[PDB]
Design a protein around this nucleic acid. Structure first.
Lengths: 295, 168, 158, 48
RNA sequence: GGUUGCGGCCAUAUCUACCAGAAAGCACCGUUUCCCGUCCGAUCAACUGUAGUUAAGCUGGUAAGAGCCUGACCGAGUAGUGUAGUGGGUGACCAUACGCGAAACUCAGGUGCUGCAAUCU
RNA sequence: GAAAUCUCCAGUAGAACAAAAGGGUAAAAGUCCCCUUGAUUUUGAUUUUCAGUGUGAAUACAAACCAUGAAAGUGUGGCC
RNA sequence: AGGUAAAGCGAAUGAUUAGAGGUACCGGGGUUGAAAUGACCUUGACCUAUUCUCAAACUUUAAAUAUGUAAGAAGUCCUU
């Protein structure tokens, strides 16, 4: 007795979920709407801006879909920000804004829209979309993608939205999921939005723990105190980092070290190998011959 | 060897059931507010029974969730009433335990003539680090058999702490 | 009274499948349709909008118009003693490409290669398709292949 | 319909058929109504 | 070759029980000023990558495993069936002639492939 | 208390979806929470019963004007 | 493209004959010291592997015969 549900009949009549769903990655109910193109356009690719947030890293991609598999136009990473003068705090709001502005300028250099559609080179924290220039080509339209991530008012996913918008791309959006948005009286507080761009929310928390609890101020901010970084220096880091991105955003790969075959030679030492069918039946001969007289 | 498998109290859930509606319930709500500090949550009926005497969607029972350091105090408060002596029931196959008391006059508190007298149902779930595996949205999965909690292992933990016994 | 509804006698036709319920794969939506392509029709039980009538299950026709989510397909049907033209408007989820015309385009390219190649060498092409001809004469070797003498078996009760 | 294609409209009628796989399937349909076999350079000479 | 991000076909990819995993990555993991959301910072949101760990997840191997997938002169030219006779038989139904032809069953072998971009003794 | 409420484990749907019956659906078309009036306007094309007449219902667009969502989109009443 | 003939029930849905085992946590009648929080009986309670027979309004599987499309100048490619 008890239950005994998992029988031969249950396994035979079980429809497996695709695989991406079985892992817990993709939502196909959302992806049907995002990927599917208007059929009067035939073969115009529908670009979508992927944004993901792993532990201590941010990922950003621009993706086109085909029958064989998805093709990447261009991609950027938060661990490349060390080149532009940012070491600590790679999973902040300011990193997501910096990564978004980096991604846009990579793609616009390939397509050829550097001078035309520059973006916003002043930044007061305003709600704006990139306007089309008269007697010329329209801006590069990219739709925003989320995945299985939650959407709330003031989340890092919508920081990358404005990064791509301020970079030059026409990413259409509303004002109501940026930080400093009054819920009752629907208006934008531009002062509170500008602070999150230049690492303001973190630099205020520097001032509080500096005077108050010194144990937390040594536990947190080890790298800031080790590399000699004061509270008011945070404005100069993210301001100068934005200018460096608008200069040479080309992507250059690493030195790598060792060839692909040397990695393959090292990796195959530890990972195990299968047996032949004769060696399987040799183990059966051992189990029979050992347990025939019993020991 | 055992570094990560610490075995700890994850949460404590107090529950006070009643059989009627209205004013007696609202008194029992303020007992758990003094007990815990948090505002409790009110359950309600699934279907009409009649023999006990409650309709469907009548609204009757109350409960509250307790986590962290505040849960460990209220557990020992309840065990002080039970003389640190639980039976060999009071323990699931998965290794979660609980016990019943009558009257909230014990474990601190007072009579307070206006509010009245009520019993409780204590219940504690036990787990290990890596319970986020099941509870998170992105990438859900089952837990391996070595990491799962059992009855015998939880009783061995319970004898070590608290100065307590199994009796049966 | 007699029953003559829209989805009458459609118990097994619009029944989904064995172990293929739920969502559809994305390749169905990605496929392109220009005005001219031949397409076979298959109804899908899950998708209820732009669904074909039972008669057009397994029929084939040419595309005449394209729009947002659908394609216009003209199908010729028999009625009385005279064929009539009919216009349908089905969504992309039901339609798939036909593989009948597929083999014809392979034959056009191969014949063009054989005519162009052989004229500057062979002076003899033979490009019309031959029906399956009868046998030619041959000899069978009996070395290590001697005939086994058979005989009809007697009757037994299993 | 097949007898109409092979020009056997009247009772007792000849033709000759070039033997293929396709033409063999026509003869399967009409086998109760016709008798047929392989001629030689002798019967063909007399008929013509 | 290992791993991450977005995928295609959607079990050769699932399910159950026991062992193994260098490097990097992924994860668990540590905190609650600020946006945010709960009965509960568990979930979601923000913050640090610092205090810790391969225990789980994830990846791979093992098992005369259940299941799923190919094939066979394995069962079987058997069941069924289009066409024909002034064929048989009281009928029920059967055999022959020219053609087309299964499914269970039994045996044998396998147990995820692959596209774009990034990275690593 | 066999049956109230509370917690964990197994759970391919064996539940539920205003009614007859069949089909369909699992990060939903089921259950709960937030905002609203695409049950709106102007007219034609088209499937089903069919004389390829009408009646009823249903499907796919054009020009408008709105709702909702960060968006892609979805919506011209009730999953069919 | 199809769900009829046949096939199938140690494969869902529903129908159905016969024992064997596990008994165990358990619903019960006894016989044994009124005894049994104990045995052995018919036992259910299901469960576990087997076994006999079925289906217009059940089905994994799946013929024959009928049935849709194609086998080119209104064609296939190159250019602008």
């Amino acid at each position: 007795f008890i239950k005994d549900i998992k029988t031969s009949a249950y396994h035979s009549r079980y429809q497996t979920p695709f695989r991406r769903r079985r892992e817990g990655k993709t939502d196909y109910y959302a992806r049907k709407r995002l990927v599917a193109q208007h059929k009067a356009k035939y073969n115009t690719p529908k670009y979508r801006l992927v944004v993901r947030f792993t532990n201590k890293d941010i990922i950003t991609q621009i993706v086109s879909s085909t029958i064989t598999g998805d093709i990447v136009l261009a991609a950027a990473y938060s661990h490349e920000l060390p080149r532009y003068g940012i070491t600590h705090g790679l999973t902040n709001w300011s990193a997501a804004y910096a990564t978004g502005l980096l991604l846009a300028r990579r793609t616009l250099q390939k397509l050829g829209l550097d001078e035309t559609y520059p973006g916003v080179e002043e930044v007061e924290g305003e709600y704006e979309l990139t306007e089309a220039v008269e007697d010329g080509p329209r801006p590069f339209k990219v739709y925003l993608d989320v995945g299985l991530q939650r959407t709330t008012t003031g989340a890092r996913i919508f920081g990358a939205l404005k990064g791509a918008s301020d970079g030059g791309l026409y990413v259409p959006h509303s004002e109501n999921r940026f930080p400093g948005w009054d819920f009752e009286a629907e208006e934008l507080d531009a002062d509170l939005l500008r602070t999150y761009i230049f690492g303001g929310h973190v630099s205020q928390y520097m001032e509080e723990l500096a005077d108050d609890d010194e144990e937390r101020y040594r536990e947190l901010f080890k790298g800031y105190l080790a590399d000699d970084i004061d509270a008011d220096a945070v404005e100069d880091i993210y301001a100068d980092a934005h200018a460096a991105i608008r200069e040479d955003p080309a992507f250059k790969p690493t030195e790598k070290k060792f060839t692909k075959e040397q990695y393959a030679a090292e990796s195959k030492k530890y990972r195990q190998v299968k047996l032949t069918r004769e060696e399987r039946k040799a183990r059966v001969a051992a189990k029979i011959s050992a347990l025939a007289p019993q020991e | 060897q055992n570094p990560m498998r610490e075995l700890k109290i994850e949460k404590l859930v107090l529950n006070i059931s009643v059989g009627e509606s209205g004013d007696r319930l609202t008194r029992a709500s303020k007992v758990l507010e003094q007990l815990s500090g948090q505002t409790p949550v009110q359950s309600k009926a699934r279907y009409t029974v009649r023999t006990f005497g409650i309709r469907r969607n009548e609204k009757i029972a109350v409960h509250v969730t307790v986590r962290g350091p505040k849960a460990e105090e209220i557990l020992e408060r309840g065990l002080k009433v039970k003389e640190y002596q639980l039976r060999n029931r009071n323990f699931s196959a998965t290794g979660n335990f609980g016990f019943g008391i009558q009257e909230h006059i014990d474990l601190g508190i007072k009579y307070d003539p206006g509010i009245g007298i009520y019993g409780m149902d204590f219940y504690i779930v036990m787990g290990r680090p890596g319970a986020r595996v099941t509870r998170r949205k992105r990438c859900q999965s089952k837990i391996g058999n070595s990491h799962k909690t059992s009855k015998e292992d939880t009783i061995a933990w319970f004898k070590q702490r608290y100065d307590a016994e199994v009796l049966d | 009274g007699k029953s003559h509804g829209y989805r009458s006698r459609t118990r097994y036709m619009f029944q989904r499948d064995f172990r293929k319920h739920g969502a559809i794969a994305l390749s169905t939506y990605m496929k392109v349709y220009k005005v001219g392509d031949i397409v076979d029709i298959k109804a899908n039980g899950s998708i209820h909008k732009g669904m074909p009538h039972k008669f057009y299950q397994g029929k084939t026709g040419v595309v005449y118009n394209v729009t947002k989510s659908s394609v216009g397909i003209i199908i010729n049907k028999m009625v009385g003693n005279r064929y009539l033209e009919k216009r349908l408007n089905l969504r992309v989820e039901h339609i798939k490409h036909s593989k009948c015309r597929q083999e014809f385009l392979e034959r056009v390219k191969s014949n063009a290669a054989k005519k162009a190649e052989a004229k500057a060498q062979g002076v003899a092409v033979q490009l019309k398709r031959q029906p399956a001809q009868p046998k030619e004469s041959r000899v069978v070797s009996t070395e290590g292949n001697v005939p086994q003498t058979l005989a009809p078996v007697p009757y037994e009760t299993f | 319909k097949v007898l109409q294609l092979l020009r056997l409209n009247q009772i007792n009628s000849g033709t000759f058929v070039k033997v293929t796989k396709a033409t063999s399937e026509l003869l399967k349909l009409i086998e109760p109504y016709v008798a047929y076999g392989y001629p030689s350079y002798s019967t063909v000479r007399q008929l013509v």
